[PDB]
Structure 1
């Protein structure tokens, strides 16, 4: 049940199964008690969704705040994405009594920064309670869900799916959500389903949620991000039971390397994806593999990502980011990772005077570490040297291409390197120093 709230500031938790009502029934209850509530979610799709749903099912039309669209009603409940919250500068003084950090199991950099910011600023902004809500707290293991029938996929079916097969008869009619590990895999499966005469659509970042029909038969093939805390009224969920993790390798060549790999899903992912169905009614969950990997610590690369976002999108100095991240790591009941704040802080502290134009470009491009990418390009232009390669990651240097010659002043590795490398550049030495001492 939703924890009570006295005048004295407090941080509390809220654990309850998928689809039980943490994001809807709980804030509706606090409001009924006369409080002003802010509900922060990672997904813009789920956030926009709460607006029409609460109005139609809970007698209240809440305020909605997203980067692109804001809907002000003056209601005592506000739904916002962590990104919009951070972009507007954090906690608005005197605006809320209760702040719900929704989907706190999420380890994407925006949510980490967002929760850490709420933690560090809420009391000061006049709030009396902060709630850390999730159906999947640290160390949780997946258990049976009363509205979800789970059925293993087999080799019987005409659609190949991660070593298994999907029968067309199980997705022919009705609404279904199929999780794939990459955007490329979504496009490919959606294409095959369409070819077979089905109404399948792909949905991931870069795409508008309107591509999903609110009603009628449909097969949505998507990645995780936008599907967090989302209700699509799906008759079933089909899970590849596969994820894509990012990891930093201190390969000392000359500094560190950030790359991505495909891995079996953990307990958090299995429970959350399964929970897209069986929401308020019976549903079916089909899977490729049984069991699950334990839900443990997140990687240090995520911390690096927090400082990158702080510098590129939120106007946070590395010191300000450390304050917020420290609040997050010193709060019990949240995902944990090795303490490498001092390190990453020192690294970014030395990356000064970045080319504002290049940064704007990598940000608009949607790259993973727009700041490190843009800074490497900055270093290249300044030394009139070519980028590690001519992958789209380095496209902001194309116009300068005829003037770039010699080895690449490699600061770190964010992808394959093709050009000859040099490790004598100051910035490179600086990063090495951070890694050394």
Structure 2
């Protein structure tokens, strides 16, 4: 099944169910043939996990690259997160024969930028093959999994869960993964469970992967941070079936609005989340709501997210980001989106001389669109004006509060606006212009 290594560069797809071996068996096979393989995965947890597993199951200690830990062994297989790959500077000259863009169903901006980088540098780097692997391609619909029995939750149970309940005997003893749409819910549920005498831990972006025990009874409560790649050896997965997403609204008031909303999971999410169990053995998947929305396309806001990440984390200029996103959108078989590259590139191109201290603060705070948030703050500081509001999002300006006055020079909307507003700032006029033509 795995694509054969051609004589000249070629991009191929690899589609197989969750747990089939795409991220482990396949690269092992390629390595056995004498090829140097690089596997890019969006999950730090899974990446670190591949190192241990491959070591004691495939008799191979691969190189590991993540922002948390690096392991260089010199093996013919390297596992790296897209993030670390971008941070390292992309493809290295003549380093690998095959590059596997693993879990290519992921629509987070880091994965998009990472895959686009590969599609644009691979051939020049000397790679002869690029593989786009996923158990859930664009137009895919959730299909029955041989190892996973799906059981709906009911109103019976001593643990409230998104309108339904979870019976304690369903998670008492054994290993279980519970998906919650938000970090706050994860903390609350874990606490609720711990209080009942169960071994429960929360996990989401920001916490150490070590919080999840390798063995022994445990109930992990997580966000989509454990949706893909990861094998936690769970006997079951309980899914709230909801997720948090973002949408861009060109509301011209004065420019655009990026609204975050909680909605039902799409087909990719349902299959990937379900697939965290039933990996190399039988498992159970319990759900709150059946069905799901179609997959295959993402919002223009994700493109905005890519430019933002490029500027804030990967030292990529807007033009550089465009080159990479074009490669991604010009390759068939991947998630599609409106072609708003010109628009978004022009938007970020005008955002110069951001206050580094603010950028640093929004990145560490883990805010969405840290560059846009920090840039709005930068403009407020320079105009000696207050932020749109005084919610956590704008705390980086508290130190200047006593000096801030007048209306806020609104560049765009990222949340609720309480203070008066002015739309005459050069940047606001520029963005409005970008939206015109």
With the length of structure 2 as denominator, give the TM-score of the two structures. Answer: 0.99
State the shift of 1:251 in Å.
1.1
State the shift of 1:227 in Å.
3.7
Greater Cα shift, 35-44 or 157-166:
157-166
State the shift of 1:368 in Å.
1.0
State the shift of 1:6 in Å.
2.0
Alignment match, 1:56: 56
Deviations 1:242-293 (A, max 9, x none): 1111101111111111111111111111100010001001100111111221
State the shift of 1:162 in Å.
1.1
State the shift of 1:407 in Å.
0.5
For 1:115 and 1:432, the matched residues in 2 are separated by 31
Contact 2:246/2:258 (8 A) holds in 1? yes
State the shift of 1:389 in Å.
1.3
Contact 2:227/2:272 (8 A) holds in 1? no
Deviations 1:326-359 (A, max 9, x none): 0000100000011000000110111111111211
Contact 2:85/2:114 (8 A) holds in 1? yes
Secondary structure in 2 matching 1:436: coil
Deviations 1:104-124 (A, max 9, x none): 000000000000000000000
For 1:368 and 1:284, the matched residues in 2 are separated by 34
Considering only aligned residues, what root-mean-square deviation do their CA atoms show, in Å?
Answer: 0.8
For 1:130 and 1:296, the matched residues in 2 are separated by 20
Secondary structure in 1 matching 2:151: strand
State the shift of 1:296 in Å.
3.3
State the shift of 1:93 in Å.
1.1
Alignment match, 2:43: 43
Contact 1:177/1:220 (8 A) holds in 2? yes
Deviations 1:380-405 (A, max 9, x none): 11111111112121122121111111
Greater Cα shift, 309-318 or 14-23:
309-318
Q: Which runs of 5+ in 2 are unaligned?
A: none
Contact 2:137/2:296 (8 A) holds in 1? no
State the shift of 1:225 in Å.
2.3
State the shift of 1:312 in Å.
1.0
Alignment match, 1:420: 420
For 2:98 and 2:12, the matched residues in 1 are separated by 11
Alignment match, 1:113: 113
Alignment match, 2:74: 74
With the length of structure 1 as denominator, give the TM-score of the two structures. Answer: 0.99
Runs of 4+ in 1 over 3 A off after TM superposition: none
For 2:359 and 2:290, the matched residues in 1 are separated by 43
Deviations 1:194-245 (A, max 9, x none): 1111111110011001111111100000001244210000000001111111
Contact 1:45/1:227 (8 A) holds in 2? no
For 1:264 and 1:227, the matched residues in 2 are separated by 15
State the shift of 1:165 in Å.
1.2
State the shift of 1:191 in Å.
1.2
Contact 1:46/1:227 (8 A) holds in 2? no
Contact 2:44/2:66 (8 A) holds in 1? yes
State the shift of 1:139 in Å.
0.8
For 1:310 and 1:292, the matched residues in 2 are separated by 32
Contact 1:44/1:226 (8 A) holds in 2? no
For 1:74 and 1:296, the matched residues in 2 are separated by 37
State the shift of 1:156 in Å.
1.4
Secondary structure in 1 matching 2:307: helix
Secondary structure in 2 matching 1:247: strand
